[PDB]
Design a protein around this ligand. Structure first.
Ligand SMILES: O=c1[nH]cnc2c1ncn2[C@@H]1O[C@H](COP(=O)(O)O)[C@@H](O)[C@H]1O
Ligand SMILES: O=c1[nH]cnc2c1ncn2[C@@H]1O[C@H](COP(=O)(O)O)[C@@H](O)[C@H]1O
Lengths: 169, 169, 169, 169
């Protein structure tokens, strides 16, 4: 467990990609006319949600939810209703796609006007369950990453950039 | 809010009906062979659960879940995994069928081997949604019942019998 | 893990002790005049709570709560308030006394009129944290018990009696 | 309910104040040596948390907790253990001091190495309970503020600045 962390994706770059995601999300929803709510998955999405929602130029609500990353259970459900609203699930990263997949199903049952997912990172190679992912900040190989909500031994979660854990020998 | 409570279903009557329900549920699942779990919906069904599981002659586990009743949110999810298991949802009362209908959808997503519902009381005259109910203790008229876990303004759950509030008397 | 279960405390005896606990609890509170609420710890106390509350002859509420049996956390808090009320925590068994001890502290902060604990079983020898326990159904040595809410490998939780797990070789 | 929103604290002003708070908190805990954890109180403080932890130059973990505000109930407890750790409760706003006062009592029970509070906004003119607040971003007049995580009828949390609702205008 002896190691070091080096910057992989500088915060300045993360900020740029998010602003763009924001324009994209805004453009995609600005004319819906229905209520919108960004749904972040805890703990991972807190930082990403913070920045992202500020880049979304349409009036919207911000709610969080926390699932158990065998059965995907709900430790903390949404505080507000989503029925008839536009819901954009926000996660820091998708790899296997299991939790995201199940969470999308659960929310689907509440009959929202629509459902989409926006992740800061995407690890295509690790996918195990195909699930739609409308907005992605970065596509990366299966690297040992941390920061921006992603931890390693309850650490680096507060880093302003995405770094890679170099596992010293 | 001034009111009276009259007996609707005496304790002995309930005790007998539950023994029967027990035999029936037992007969149904005795030859399944996969794990079985009864899921009571807090708060109202804790008493019915306590008595019912004691009449179920097949080895099972007991878990609980608490749900809201606009969107149906999970205030307390199961501690157990139900995937590939016979699941018997234990409810105290079904009238409109909204909440149960949804709770059932949510568990269905976890892919249990089988999914059924067992309710103590049933007000068919109140049904708004078609929902499969495999076991019913009593089909009753549209009375405001209390006791045996059920309440009236956080009151009467401890009554050993199902009673009906009269009011203005 | 190969074993068998033999009856240690017959349900008929459990029922008798509970009726007596009920008289004792009733006598102790009947003149308070304040609101009363029995607080059961999930999953363990569901069955005991069911029977016990029926033996308590004073008007009271029934709420449940579930803690994490290193830090004692609250997975599901009470649905109702206890401030200014008489609160009787109900558990199936106390051994180390850790969870019970912490739960009593947490509820204490809400300033209830009073706080007491009632357990069906007590394992004095295993105590690690001294905490008051006003009502006990049975005092037993450190036996491998199951039933009446107490499980073993998600099993025997529904047994109507307290049995001892004979660990066959 | 007809209203207007005016800027009260511009985004740049907040950004600068947080950098300062960051230096201060860093200076305070840099030589402690035990694990440290910032606990944000959902929902209102997710944004302040996101920005604050990035200015804290000491290795820490980030966790969240959601509480009610008559009795103070835990709707979502921490995922981490705080025993023997420096704990920095991260709040968005403190006015009466009731909720924080209680949340602090609850965590205090888990025996952390140290326990402090850091709030972005403060309405001293609204204080009803004496509660220790170690770090404050801004002491403000009694205005109904929104933005930067804070809301008005589930609205405005995404604003990058603290604004004040005007109403009937
Ligand atoms: O007579 C009643 N008094 C109090 N609550 C009731 C009564 N009938 C139904 N409920 C509530 O409605 C729920 C069942 O709703 P359903 O599944 O939508 O039919 C129960 O779990 C109860 O909490
Ligand atoms: O101006 C306001 N608008 C909306 N909610 C507020 C406002 N001021 C305080 N609150 C709520 O009150 C809580 C703080 O209460 P305290 O800790 O009891 O002082 C915050 O977490 C908010 O949820």
């Amino acid at each position: 467990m002896k190691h070091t962390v080096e910057v992989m994706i500088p915060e300045a770059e993360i900020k740029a990609r998010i602003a763009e995601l924001g324009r994209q999300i805004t453009e995609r929803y600005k004319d819906s006319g229905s209520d919108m709510v960004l749904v972040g998955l805890l703990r991972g999405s807190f930082m990403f949600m913070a920045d992202l929602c500020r880049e979304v130029q349409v009036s919207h609500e911000v709610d969080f939810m926390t699932a158990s990353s065998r059965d995907l259970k709900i430790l903390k459900d949404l505080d507000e209703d989503i029925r008839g609203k536009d819901v954009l699930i926000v996660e820091d990263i998708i790899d296997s796609g299991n939790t995201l997949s199940k969470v999308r199903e659960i929310l689907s049952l509440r009959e929202p006007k629509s459902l989409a997912i926006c992740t800061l990172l995407d690890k295509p190679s690790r996918r195990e369950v195909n699930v739609p992912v409308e907005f992605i900040g970065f596509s990366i190989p299966d690297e040992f990453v941390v920061g921006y909500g992603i931890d390693y031994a309850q650490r680096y979660r507060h880093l302003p950039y995405i770094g890679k854990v170099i596992l010293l020998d």
